[PDB]
């Protein structure tokens, strides 16, 4: 194949609109009531076209 690195990653430059996230990120949570979350994980998942971009795993929902 040929190079496709520029299509693979997108960096952010200061005050650069093109390099910034020009989209409202789908900040859905992989919450407890989810078959793949084992029921006690609230993974705040920032997605960009279903691509896992940011992770905020809220644990301690089973902390006893």
């Amino acid at each position: 194949m040929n190079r496709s690195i520029f299509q693979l990653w997108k960096p952010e430059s200061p005050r650069s609109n093109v390099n910034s996230k020009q989209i409202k990120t789908m900040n859905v949570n992989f919450g407890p009531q989810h078959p793949a979350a084992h029921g006690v994980l609230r993974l705040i998942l920032q997605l960009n076209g279903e691509i896992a971009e940011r992770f905020d795993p809220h644990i301690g929902l089973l902390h006893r």
Binding site: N2, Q7, G31, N48
Partner: protein, 120 residues
């Protein structure tokens, strides 16, 4: 392709949906719904959703969509010769093979430039 009989059958399907609606109402007789704060709110695995109307996708496959349009058009163009291939001649055979070759060439060019995958 059908006719007014197909239209009347669509009407009959609507009437069948009316029958299902009657059954659902009769079932609605058999329970009570109590108003609650989060009962009629969005479900996001047990916690309130932080977005209501602004749920935007990234749409990284617009190249795939436009290629789908073009290649669906090409397949529609290919349909007539295959429907009447028994009467093919030198001209028709050459045109069909050249058209399929052009489709293959377009696909191969799409592959070479890595536009058939997801982008960031």
């Amino acid at each position: 392709m059908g006719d007014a009989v197909v239209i009347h059958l669509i009407q009959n399907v609507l009437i069948f949906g009316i029958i299902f609606w009657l059954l659902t109402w009769g079932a609605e007789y058999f329970y009570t719904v109590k108003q609650q704060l989060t009962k009629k709110q969005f479900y996001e695995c047990g916690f309130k959703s932080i977005s209501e109307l602004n749920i935007q996708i990234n749409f990284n496959f617009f190249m795939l969509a436009v290629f789908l349009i073009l290649y669906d058009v090409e397949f529609t163009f290919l349909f007539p010769v295959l429907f009447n291939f028994s009467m093919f001649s030198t001209t028709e055979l050459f045109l069909a093979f050249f058209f399929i070759f052009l489709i293959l060439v377009s696909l191969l060019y799409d592959w070479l430039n890595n536009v058939l995958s997801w982008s960031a």
